[PDB]
Design a protein around this motif. Structure first.
Motif, PDB file in Angstrom:
ATOM      1  N   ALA A  32       0.836  -1.191   0.000  1.00 30.10           N
ATOM      2  CA  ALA A  32       0.000   0.000   0.000  1.00 30.10           C
ATOM      3  C   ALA A  32       0.874   1.245   0.000  1.00 30.10           C
ATOM      4  CB  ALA A  32      -0.936   0.013   1.212  1.00 30.10           C
ATOM      5  N   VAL A  33       0.461   2.240  -0.779  1.00 31.40           N
ATOM      6  CA  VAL A  33       1.129   3.531  -0.846  1.00 31.40           C
ATOM      7  C   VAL A  33       0.068   4.595  -0.612  1.00 31.40           C
ATOM      8  CG1 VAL A  33       2.614   5.057  -2.173  1.00 31.40           C
ATOM      9  CG2 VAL A  33       2.752   2.582  -2.491  1.00 31.40           C
ATOM     10  N   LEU A  34       0.100   5.222   0.561  1.00 29.97           N
ATOM     11  CA  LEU A  34      -0.867   6.256   0.910  1.00 29.97           C
ATOM     12  C   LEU A  34      -0.451   7.557   0.240  1.00 29.97           C
ATOM     13  CD1 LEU A  34      -1.162   5.413   4.704  1.00 29.97           C
ATOM     14  CD2 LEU A  34      -1.942   4.125   2.715  1.00 29.97           C
ATOM     15  N   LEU A  35      -1.174   7.947  -0.809  1.00 33.25           N
ATOM     16  CA  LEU A  35      -0.874   9.164  -1.558  1.00 33.25           C
ATOM     17  C   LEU A  35      -1.784  10.273  -1.040  1.00 33.25           C
ATOM     18  CD1 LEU A  35      -0.015   9.242  -5.299  1.00 33.25           C
ATOM     19  CD2 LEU A  35      -1.278  11.121  -4.248  1.00 33.25           C
ATOM     20  N   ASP A  36      -1.450  10.777   0.142  1.00 33.69           N
ATOM     21  CA  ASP A  36      -2.243  11.785   0.827  1.00 33.69           C
ATOM     22  C   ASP A  36      -1.421  13.052   1.023  1.00 33.69           C
ATOM     23  OD1 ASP A  36      -3.972  13.244   2.573  1.00 33.69           O
ATOM     24  OD2 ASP A  36      -4.899  11.344   3.158  1.00 33.69           O
ATOM     25  N   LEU A  37      -2.095  14.103   1.483  1.00 37.83           N
ATOM     26  CA  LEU A  37      -1.441  15.386   1.667  1.00 37.83           C
ATOM     27  C   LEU A  37      -0.372  15.287   2.754  1.00 37.83           C
ATOM     28  CD1 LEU A  37      -4.414  17.872   1.392  1.00 37.83           C
ATOM     29  CD2 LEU A  37      -2.271  18.068   0.129  1.00 37.83           C
ATOM     30  N   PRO A  38       0.694  16.084   2.656  1.00 36.12           N
ATOM     31  CA  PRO A  38       1.754  16.010   3.674  1.00 36.12           C
ATOM     32  C   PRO A  38       1.266  16.314   5.077  1.00 36.12           C
ATOM     33  CG  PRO A  38       1.994  17.986   2.341  1.00 36.12           C
ATOM     34  CD  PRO A  38       0.938  17.161   1.682  1.00 36.12           C
ATOM     35  N   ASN A  39       0.305  17.224   5.222  1.00 34.50           N
ATOM     36  CA  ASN A  39      -0.218  17.595   6.530  1.00 34.50           C
ATOM     37  C   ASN A  39      -1.320  16.665   7.015  1.00 34.50           C
ATOM     38  OD1 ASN A  39      -2.921  18.810   5.519  1.00 34.50           O
ATOM     39  ND2 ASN A  39      -1.374  19.923   4.333  1.00 34.50           N
ATOM     40  N   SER A  40      -1.704  15.665   6.221  1.00 36.75           N
ATOM     41  CA  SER A  40      -2.782  14.764   6.605  1.00 36.75           C
ATOM     42  C   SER A  40      -2.394  13.820   7.733  1.00 36.75           C
ATOM     43  CB  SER A  40      -3.232  13.945   5.398  1.00 36.75           C
ATOM     44  OG  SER A  40      -2.264  12.967   5.067  1.00 36.75           O
ATOM     45  N   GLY A  41      -1.123  13.773   8.112  1.00 38.12           N
ATOM     46  CA  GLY A  41      -0.694  12.842   9.139  1.00 38.12           C
ATOM     47  C   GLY A  41      -0.839  11.393   8.728  1.00 38.12           C
ATOM     48  N   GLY A  42      -0.468  11.063   7.493  1.00 37.73           N
ATOM     49  CA  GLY A  42      -0.555   9.700   7.014  1.00 37.73           C
ATOM     50  C   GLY A  42       0.676   8.884   7.351  1.00 37.73           C
ATOM     51  N   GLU A  43       1.781   9.564   7.663  1.00 40.01           N
ATOM     52  CA  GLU A  43       2.994   8.850   8.047  1.00 40.01           C
ATOM     53  C   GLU A  43       2.748   7.987   9.276  1.00 40.01           C
ATOM     54  OE1 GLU A  43       2.562  12.007   7.500  1.00 40.01           O
ATOM     55  OE2 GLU A  43       3.434  13.322   9.026  1.00 40.01           O
ATOM     56  N   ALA A  44       1.960   8.489  10.227  1.00 37.51           N
ATOM     57  CA  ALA A  44       1.591   7.676  11.379  1.00 37.51           C
ATOM     58  C   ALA A  44       0.823   6.438  10.942  1.00 37.51           C
ATOM     59  CB  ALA A  44       0.763   8.502  12.361  1.00 37.51           C
ATOM     60  N   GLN A  45      -0.083   6.593   9.975  1.00 43.20           N
ATOM     61  CA  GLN A  45      -0.827   5.444   9.470  1.00 43.20           C
ATOM     62  C   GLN A  45       0.096   4.463   8.759  1.00 43.20           C
ATOM     63  OE1 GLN A  45      -3.524   5.206  10.679  1.00 43.20           O
ATOM     64  NE2 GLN A  45      -4.314   7.269  11.067  1.00 43.20           N
ATOM     65  N   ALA A  46       1.073   4.973   8.008  1.00 46.40           N
ATOM     66  CA  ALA A  46       2.030   4.086   7.355  1.00 46.40           C
ATOM     67  C   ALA A  46       2.824   3.290   8.381  1.00 46.40           C
ATOM     68  CB  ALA A  46       2.969   4.893   6.460  1.00 46.40           C
ATOM     69  N   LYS A  47       3.264   3.945   9.457  1.00 42.09           N
ATOM     70  CA  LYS A  47       3.965   3.228  10.518  1.00 42.09           C
ATOM     71  C   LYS A  47       3.061   2.188  11.166  1.00 42.09           C
ATOM     72  CE  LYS A  47       7.827   5.645  10.296  1.00 42.09           C
ATOM     73  NZ  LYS A  47       7.476   6.432   9.082  1.00 42.09           N
ATOM     74  N   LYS A  48       1.802   2.548  11.422  1.00 41.30           N
ATOM     75  CA  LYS A  48       0.893   1.635  12.104  1.00 41.30           C
ATOM     76  C   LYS A  48       0.528   0.439  11.235  1.00 41.30           C
ATOM     77  CE  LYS A  48      -3.548   2.369  12.651  1.00 41.30           C
ATOM     78  NZ  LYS A  48      -4.825   3.025  13.039  1.00 41.30           N
ATOM     79  N   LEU A  49       0.519   0.610   9.912  1.00 45.42           N
ATOM     80  CA  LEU A  49       0.097  -0.475   9.034  1.00 45.42           C
ATOM     81  C   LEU A  49       1.173  -1.545   8.899  1.00 45.42           C
ATOM     82  CD1 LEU A  49      -1.830   1.571   6.370  1.00 45.42           C
ATOM     83  CD2 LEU A  49      -2.726  -0.421   7.568  1.00 45.42           C
ATOM     84  N   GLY A  50       2.445  -1.157   8.943  1.00 45.05           N
ATOM     85  CA  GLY A  50       3.555  -2.080   8.905  1.00 45.05           C
ATOM     86  C   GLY A  50       4.576  -1.659   7.876  1.00 45.05           C
ATOM     87  N   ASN A  51       5.501  -2.574   7.582  1.00 42.45           N
ATOM     88  CA  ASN A  51       6.518  -2.319   6.573  1.00 42.45           C
ATOM     89  C   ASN A  51       5.973  -2.425   5.158  1.00 42.45           C
ATOM     90  OD1 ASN A  51       8.833  -3.411   8.839  1.00 42.45           O
ATOM     91  ND2 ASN A  51       9.400  -1.739   7.452  1.00 42.45           N
ATOM     92  N   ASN A  52       4.857  -3.130   4.967  1.00 36.60           N
ATOM     93  CA  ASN A  52       4.260  -3.218   3.639  1.00 36.60           C
ATOM     94  C   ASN A  52       3.781  -1.854   3.163  1.00 36.60           C
ATOM     95  OD1 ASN A  52       4.583  -5.880   2.783  1.00 36.60           O
ATOM     96  ND2 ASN A  52       2.776  -6.594   3.908  1.00 36.60           N
ATOM     97  N   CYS A  53       3.160  -1.080   4.046  1.00 41.46           N
ATOM     98  CA  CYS A  53       2.588   0.204   3.677  1.00 41.46           C
ATOM     99  C   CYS A  53       3.623   1.313   3.801  1.00 41.46           C
ATOM    100  CB  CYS A  53       1.379   0.526   4.556  1.00 41.46           C
ATOM    101  SG  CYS A  53       0.545   2.063   4.113  1.00 41.46           S
ATOM    102  N   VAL A  54       3.535   2.287   2.896  1.00 46.58           N
ATOM    103  CA  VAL A  54       4.375   3.476   2.934  1.00 46.58           C
ATOM    104  C   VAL A  54       3.488   4.695   2.727  1.00 46.58           C
ATOM    105  CG1 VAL A  54       6.464   2.317   2.169  1.00 46.58           C
ATOM    106  CG2 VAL A  54       4.913   3.298   0.479  1.00 46.58           C
ATOM    107  N   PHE A  55       4.011   5.855   3.109  1.00 43.54           N
ATOM    108  CA  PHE A  55       3.310   7.123   2.966  1.00 43.54           C
ATOM    109  C   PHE A  55       4.011   7.974   1.919  1.00 43.54           C
ATOM    110  CE2 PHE A  55       3.009  11.642   4.434  1.00 43.54           C
ATOM    111  CZ  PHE A  55       1.734  11.856   3.960  1.00 43.54           C
TER     112      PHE A  55
END
Ligand SMILES: NC(=O)c1ccc[n+]([C@@H]2O[C@H](COP(=O)([O-])OP(=O)(O)OC[C@H]3O[C@@H](n4cnc5c(N)ncnc54)[C@H](O)[C@@H]3O)[C@@H](O)[C@H]2O)c1
Ligand SMILES: NC(=O)c1ccc[n+]([C@@H]2O[C@H](COP(=O)([O-])OP(=O)(O)OC[C@H]3O[C@@H](n4cnc5c(N)ncnc54)[C@H](O)[C@@H]3O)[C@@H](O)[C@H]2O)c1
Ligand SMILES: NC(=O)c1ccc[n+]([C@@H]2O[C@H](COP(=O)([O-])OP(=O)(O)OC[C@H]3O[C@@H](n4cnc5c(N)ncnc54)[C@H](O)[C@@H]3O)[C@@H](O)[C@H]2O)c1
Ligand SMILES: NC(=O)c1ccc[n+]([C@@H]2O[C@H](COP(=O)([O-])OP(=O)(O)OC[C@H]3O[C@@H](n4cnc5c(N)ncnc54)[C@H](O)[C@@H]3O)[C@@H](O)[C@H]2O)c1
Ligand SMILES: Nc1ncnc2c1ncn2[C@@H]1O[C@H](CSCC[C@H](N)C(=O)O)[C@@H](O)[C@H]1O
Lengths: 255, 211, 255, 255, 255
Positions: free
Chosen positions: E31-54
């Motif tokens: 998974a690649v979360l293509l969201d706004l920089p201020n959306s705080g998606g990096e936390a979601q990428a960390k929580k999802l695991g190594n498979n997901c990136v922000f």
RNA sequence: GAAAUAUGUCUGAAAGAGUUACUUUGAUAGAGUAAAUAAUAGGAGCCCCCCUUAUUUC
């Protein structure tokens, strides 16, 4: 009878808009061809008569539409009808793997700006003028007829931006028909199929003849006079609201 | 015979009124019932006040262009809220009105608030569609004139009163009107109704006729 | 105009069909009311004038519709338009858990037979009778106008069979628009919303006021004259084919 | 997961219904193939396993469907899902002027009865049967999945009756969803396009290749396994209701 | 099965996009979360695991989407799915005669750019990446799933711009499904109704509760997990293409 | 210092029309079950006059 009604027709210097203006002026109504400065619409206004005037405006610009509406109000005092026939067509595939060509975002943005943003801008700026009017016997204060396309339902290849804009118009016909329902402004949409007008000059002549042969009945390109007739019928009928009418001739566009 | 619809008109009417109230909560014009007069009212006065609020919100719920009624300063633990909950029952949480503990001055610009009270000197020329009207929920059996005003002036709000005498021959009677009457009047003025139509909801005993 | 056109109108002794017949006759056309023997349509035909005739027929019966078409041909020698306004309504829940009541199959079958099977029977027979018409300038030999309902799109509770029949009409509008395209016949469908006909006016005045309030604009029950006007506009426009027009005033039927 | 669910599949002895039964039984569910007595469904039920049982019933007959549902309850104790995949097709033009041939009313009535009336009869009887089920965690007492066709939207020449029936199913999908919403039964419709079933496999390989070429992507006849997968996805999703899903691979049936 | 796939999810840091990313990653896909920089998606990428990136990008900016897609390719070397869930909602009346207030054009342009132009930009820039993939055994190179709304079909008052953008997405679903059909990319649209995501934070709580109670069944706000489930079902079905699926729960909105 | 009316939904001599909540209503829902209404501005003695309360005539 549309005697005395003042109609503001955008893109009225060519094709469907000009046909609608011709039919409306020919039956006593007034016309304000709200068109581009270089479209040569002043000649068409002169041809139509004194009942018709030409407003040089770009629908994508708020100031130009405001100036055109002010001109219409000053000249005729009312805006009893609006026709949104101003639009452009662009043919470009989303992505061409063989040629490695990707649809330019500029073309998509321009097509949306002219068609969807332009139509909404005209609707929103003419809603005020039609709301300053006094309701007639029935509560009506005006009618707005948008020009979507059958590309909003069955679009062909290399027609993504055009179909996006026309689908936007089709979708927003009802929300705007409910926003202005308290006022009494009817908002209809027409989705013409293949019509004989300059918009088809881009397509190859052989392709145009093939398409005209593909219409189930009548197997010909739609006459702009028929679009004008449908617009007049929509204006006359006070119970047609929040609906899209496919004036295409039963043609369903294959891929 | 041949029937097109099932006989479910009461359910459908309530659903449609709910849809219209949901739209009004978003794009409607605020109307405030200032519940801050708990001190003055007695037990029976508070019972009516609640009953009149019920009837008023019922009238506005069925309008064609409903207001967005605000129950401002409605203390949660007070007797107003207690009786409102008792009367509405399971519906109190489904009503499409804003019930808030914050004074109306905390929700709207102070320049868009007009507190309607007969004790005000200014008369209501025309019903403005860019303003907020504050109808202090109250029942003054033990008259305390200048209450709603005094509080309107304390909050530093503009005040107005309906033109009862300018369009009616009051003769003798209590100028104050029941909350339901006021909301019906304001709903008639909000719908292009002239003062003649709007003021027809005044009790007939209070006036001989129009002028 | 519609001068000289012969129209076969089913359900023409009441409501929308009667309004269509009135408008067409008043515009100089000819009408052939096609309703049940006990429909009291003979009085309506007598009132309309000599241009209008009445033929007792059942749209669900092939022989009766054939006799009505033969009467129309004998009286006027030509059938140029067909208007399938003949239908019935039935409201009943598919299943009621509380009452333990299940929708009867006979109700569904008769609603289909009248609304859908009768409409198609009239369509096919009048298409057969329209093939003998010499094509006009545009090659057109006739126009067939069905009558769906907005239910066909958003039917309410207890409108399962009615919605099924109207949705069948809506679905088969285009297949028949293509079947008869070589002949030159045009097939269109009108989906009226809430109209002030004996189907609703007989309801309690509170119910009718509620239904009127339901319409966004015009906030009133539909006028059958508006349906007649739309039918005439469809007849006059040659490029309207294989399309459904919602004549409902922007009302989306409530759940 | 779909383990333990009891599914009544109409017309499951062949085609899309058989694929749905195969997938559902393979996932652990139970199946009641409700097809014609002379359909070979007994062999398929035996092949699938003990979880699958064949019940000879004619959907157009109320008594047969009642007996089949009683057998389903006796064998499995409940009905948790229903899949209306039973239906027929007819090829016939509304009117062929050259041949002087008119559509038979018997064909239209028969197609209506088998498809639309049969689907409604099964839907109502299944709603009665599934009402007795205790609501699950989400309150759902069952699911009903109807089979429509893209003929309901883009019908082809000589497809009047089939298009009418499928349009009726599409129209009644929402009214029945609202009828059964309080009970907790979800009603959905699937509009498959071209699928490699006996309805199309029996055709000559030339036309089958042409049809496979017609579909924009995947450029093949639909796989009934994909219809079964979509049915399972609809069963698993608790928030899909009153909606038509076009599982046709982007093909828009040309005239 | 969806194991081993790579999905670029725009607006994946919140709501429906986050739910889809969660389901896909839990199922095994990347998974690649293509969201706004201020959306705080990096936390979601960390929580999802190594498979997901922000991937911090703005869908309305071509360069940002290009950089995000390049990052996705570098990290995972493949793009098999593209989920366009990035969008915004605006509630503003077209014209408010009572308050004399007209819809701002900046609001309309903002909504269009974020939703429609953004979705098309992502589609066109990810079709290039998905065109490099080796076709699967079925010939598929990838799947693009857009997010629309039922507003695209029937928007309510003060929903003109949002409805226009969603209607544009719905309209262009099929043209782009045909543009990329030769290169085996499936373009599908999902039209959710009401879902319990931060997008409803603007709405009053009582309005949200009422709308939830107005869903026929299930009579509650949709669960984003259900949108993720439908996205997965679309990914797993190769015969779903060029179609819009209303995941609304049978709710039809009203003014 | 004397006189007046003074109905908190309205109309009123008890009552009628209205208000609120729940009933998925087979065509009389044209309804049921439950809230609100039984000292006419507040209280007293007995319709009758007594003080107070908002008005209004010298
Ligand atoms: N031609 C067809 O068959 C067909 C079919 C379906 C839909 N349409 C739509 O119908 C409408 C009618 O176009 P047409 O067929 O007459 O082609 P046309 O080119 O003759 O008409 C388009 C008009 O829009 C005007 N215009 C464009 N941009 C403008 C702007 N910014 N401000 C003002 N005027 C502007 C042009 O000057 C011209 O007068 C268009 O919106 C077209 O997309 C046409
Ligand atoms: N009334 C509405 O609001 C409304 C709304 C949408 C659609 N419709 C449809 O419009 C059509 C017009 O009907 P209407 O609204 O005027 O109601 P109506 O009952 O007044 O008209 C129906 C007519 O059909 C005739 N008829 C009925 N069964 C017949 C049969 N078997 N053979 C021949 N004639 C038969 C009746 O005698 C009557 O003249 C109907 O199909 C109706 O369902 C009506
Ligand atoms: N084949 C396609 O591509 C396609 C496309 C769109 C829709 N459909 C619909 O899909 C459904 C499945 O058809 P199919 O493709 O599996 O062909 P099929 O002939 O294999 O399926 C029809 C089944 O229905 C059964 N059946 C017919 N009449 C019956 C009755 N009265 N009672 C009980 N059972 C009866 C038949 O025995 C058979 O098992 C049909 O309803 C068809 O109209 C098919
Ligand atoms: N919420 C609903 O019930 C509902 C219903 C129908 C459709 N939708 C659509 O579903 C989508 C998901 O919204 P949601 O409900 O999850 O709300 P949301 O706000 O949680 O989702 C929007 C997401 O898009 C991101 N985003 C916004 N603008 C962006 C931009 N320019 N570039 C990149 N990322 C951007 C936001 O950061 C956020 O993560 C939206 O497109 C919405 O219109 C939602
Ligand atoms: N004639 C009138 N003009 C303006 N507002 C009035 C009015 N009659 C009644 N109202 C409104 O109805 C409410 C209940 S009447 C109670 C009146 C009390 N004297 C007070 O201090 O307000 C009043 O508070 C006021 O908001």
């Amino acid at each position: 009878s549309v005697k005395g009604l003042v109609a503001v027709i955008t893109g009225g210097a060519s094709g469907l808009g000009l046909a609608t203006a011709e039919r409306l002026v020919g039956q006593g109504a007034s016309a304000v061809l709200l068109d581009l400065p270089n479209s040569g619409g002043e000649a068409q206004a002169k041809k139509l008569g004194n009942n018709c005037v030409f407003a040089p405006a770009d629908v994508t610009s708020e100031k130009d539409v405001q100036t055109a509406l002010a001109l219409a109000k000053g000249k005729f005092g009312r805006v009893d009808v609006a026709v949104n026939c101003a639009g452009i067509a662009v043919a470009s595939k989303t992505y061409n793997l063989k040629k490695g060509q990707t649809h330019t975002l500029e073309d998509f943005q321009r097509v949306l700006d002219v068609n969807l943003m332009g139509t909404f801008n005209v609707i929103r700026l003419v809603a005020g003028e039609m709301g300053q009017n006094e309701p007639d016997q029935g509560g009506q204060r005006g009618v707005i007829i948008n020009t979507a396309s059958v590309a909003a339902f069955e679009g062909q290849v290399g027609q993504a931006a055009y179909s996006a804009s026309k689908g936007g118009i089709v979708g927003m016909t009802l929300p705007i028909a409910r926003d202005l329902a308290p006022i009494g402004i009817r908002v209809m949409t027409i989705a013409p199929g293949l019509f004989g007008t300059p918009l088809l000059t881009s397509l190859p002549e052989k392709v145009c003849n093939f398409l005209a042969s593909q219409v189930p009945f009548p197997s010909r390109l739609g006459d702009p006079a028929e679009y004008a007739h449908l617009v007049q019928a929509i204006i006359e009928n006070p119970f047609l609201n929040g609906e899209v009418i496919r004036l295409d001739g039963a043609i369903r566009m294959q891929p | 015979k041949n029937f097109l619809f099932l006989r479910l008109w009461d359910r459908n009417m309530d659903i449609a009124m709910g849809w219209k109230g949901a739209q009004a909560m978003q794009f409607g014009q605020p109307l405030v019932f200032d519940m801050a007069y708990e001190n003055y009212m007695k037990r029976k006065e508070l019972q009516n006040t609640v009953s009149q609020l019920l009837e008023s919100e019922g009238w506005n719920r069925r309008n064609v262009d409903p207001f967005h009624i605000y129950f401002c300063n409605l203390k949660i633990d007070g007797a107003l809220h207690r009786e409102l909950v008792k009367r509405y029952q399971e519906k109190w949480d489904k009503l499409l009105l804003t019930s808030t503990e914050k004074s109306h001055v905390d929700l709207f610009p102070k320049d868009s608030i007009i507190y309607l009270t007969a004790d005000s000197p200014n008369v209501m020329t025309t019903f403005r569609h860019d303003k907020v009207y504050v109808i202090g929920s109250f029942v003054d059996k033990s008259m305390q004139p200048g209450t709603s005003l005094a509080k309107a002036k304390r909050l530093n709000l503009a005040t107005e009163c309906l033109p009862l005498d300018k369009y009616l021959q009051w003769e003798i009677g209590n100028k104050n009107l029941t909350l339901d009457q006021m909301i019906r009047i304001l709903l008639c003025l909000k719908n292009n109704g002239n003062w003649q139509e709007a003021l027809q909801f005044v009790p007939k005993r209070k006036h001989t006729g129009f002028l």
